Write a structure and sequence with these properties.
The PDB classes it as membrane protein. The entry lists the keywords Membrane protein. This is part of a larger assembly, with chains A (43 residues) and B (81 residues). Chain A is mostly loops. Chain A contains no helices and no strands. The termini of chain A are far apart. Chain B is an all-alpha fold and 81 residues long. Classes of the chains: A little secondary structure (43), B mainly alpha (81). Chains A and B meet through loops of A and helix 1 of B.
């Protein structure tokens, strides 16, 4: 009545590298001193 | 060393923790705006934004230098009279 099936192996789609991607925190608002025209008027 | 105090800011958890409404552009904000608009404006003319060497600002500051030397010579010969 019906045909027969054989347990051929399942194929593997590339799975996930289920790791822990880590990200470095940004810099820390470096303090900038006033421009100071006296030492800024040379040109 | 000199024991510096890196800028810090916690929370409030009270009544005076949402009352200020003071709009005043700090120096950092205007620097940041300048930089962002000079990294976008260098992303539609150079088509790369690693920002290692910016020639656009170079051009603009060159024309500005022309203008400044212009006005300098103008007055330095206005003193001639």
């Amino acid at each position: 009545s019906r045909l027969i099936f054989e347990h051929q192996r399942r194929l593997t789609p590339p799975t996930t590298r289920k790791g822990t991607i880590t990200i470095e925190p940004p810099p820390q608002l470096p303090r900038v001193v006033p421009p100071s025209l006296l030492r800024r008027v040379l040109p | 060393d000199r024991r510096s105090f890196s800028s810090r800011t916690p929370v409030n958890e009270n009544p005076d923790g949402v009352q200020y409404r003071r709009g005043f552009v700090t120096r950092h904000q205007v620097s940041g705006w300048r930089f962002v608009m000079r990294r976008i404006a260098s992303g539609v003319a150079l088509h790369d934004t690693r920002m290692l060497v910016d020639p656009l600002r170079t051009q603009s500051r060159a024309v500005l230098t022309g203008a400044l030397i212009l006005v300098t010579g103008l007055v330095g010969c206005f003193i001639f009279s």
